[PDB]
């Protein structure tokens with residue numbers, strides 16, 4: 600296995616309640632192994648709304664992210680977040696701007712994997 604699907608749910612700051620941020624990421628994501636390193640690849644819908652995003656492990660280490668696909672037409676963006684096997688969540692901090700309802704906000708949420716990122720290959 601070079602990769603495997605991994606489902607997740609983005610949940611609200613301070614609880615296990617689903618966050619409506621979950622509605623703007625494709626499901627499942629994917630765990631990808633390259634050489635000795637692991638990536639969580641995920642697709643952001645309504646990419647133009649995500650003005651900033653940072654991901655952290657549960658020990659508050661910022662995780663490197665790369666853009667691997669920007670699709671202007673579909674308004675999506677595919678990103679690779681650096682992870683390790685064993686992570687059960689990521690903390691996200693995002694700056695979201697929604698024109699139609701004049702919204703400009705920063706939020707913190709926690710993305711919860713269906714299970715610990717597995718070792719592969």
Ligand code: HEM
Nearest residue numbers: 611617618619620621623645648693695697700704706708
């Ligand atoms: C499609 C246009 C969107 C509309 C009309 C919308 C609307 C709203 C409204 C009215 C609230 C409650 C007030 C507030 O705290 O701001 C809210 C909360 C929130 N929104 Fe959005 N939103 C949109 C897109 C997004 C996107 C793309 C994200 C990022 C993935 C996002 C993430 C959040 C988060 C994290 C909250 C806090 C409550 C929760 O965690 O569910 N929203 N949104």
